[PDB]
Design a protein around this ligand. Structure first.
Ligand SMILES: CC1(C)Nc2nc(N)[nH]c(=O)c2N=C1CNCCN1CCC(SC[C@H]2O[C@@H](n3cnc4c(N)ncnc43)[C@H](O)[C@@H]2O)CC1
Length: 154
């Protein structure tokens, strides 16, 4: 299954944190990285007085169950992390899990607010411009409907 994962961090200098998170993702059992987007520098969604965020997206091929992947992404956040409107040491958000639809206590997939976040959508569109959501919406169509500002690269 191909899972799309959003990565964010606004440690003053988040490159090393993001690279470490990516290595950890690639080390998850029964999983490997297919593609990584460019690194993007985005203004805080929240109080404008914290550092800019580094946002990216990753396509991860995996045989894990969705909640098993979430267990690994949560583990990685704890191991490299340390709030509400930021700053954020490391966030890993499951955007899509193949074509699955999940609405549990622990997991909402597709991700419950990605439709409203250009810093999630634009990096995904880079690595998966043809993506269709489980409900038949097209990523390209969402960006075209909303006209979110394009992102600057890190
Ligand atoms: C401060 C803010 C709004 N401003 C930002 N400004 C820019 N520019 N860039 C950013 O990047 C950016 N980020 C954020 C904060 N994003 C945290 C998103 N995230 C919340 C959900 C979970 S943290 C709470 C809970 O969400 C549950 N969850 C439900 N669905 C999912 C799912 N699909 N993926 C993961 N967790 C799931 C999970 O059980 C967890 O306990 C992990 C992290």
């Amino acid at each position: 299954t191909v899972a799309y994962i959003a990565i964010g961090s606004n440690l003053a200098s988040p490159l090393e944190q993001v690279n470490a998170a990516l290595k950890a993702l690639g080390d998850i059992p029964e999983s490997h990285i297919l593609t990584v987007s460019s690194f993007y520098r985005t203004p805080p969604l929240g109080p404008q007085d914290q550092p800019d965020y580094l946002n990216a997206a990753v396509a991860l091929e995996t045989s894990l169950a969705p909640e098993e992947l979430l267990n690994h992404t949560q583990r990685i956040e704890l191991q490299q992390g340390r709030e509400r409107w930021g700053p954020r040491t490391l966030d890993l958000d499951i955007m899509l899990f193949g074509n699955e639809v999940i609405n549990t206590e622990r997991l909402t997939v597709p991700h419950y607010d990605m439709k409203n976040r250009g810093f999630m959508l634009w990096p995904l569109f880079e690595i998966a411009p043809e993506l269709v959501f489980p409900d038949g919406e097209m990523l390209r169509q969402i960006l075209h409907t909303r006209a979110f500002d394009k992102l600057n690269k890190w």
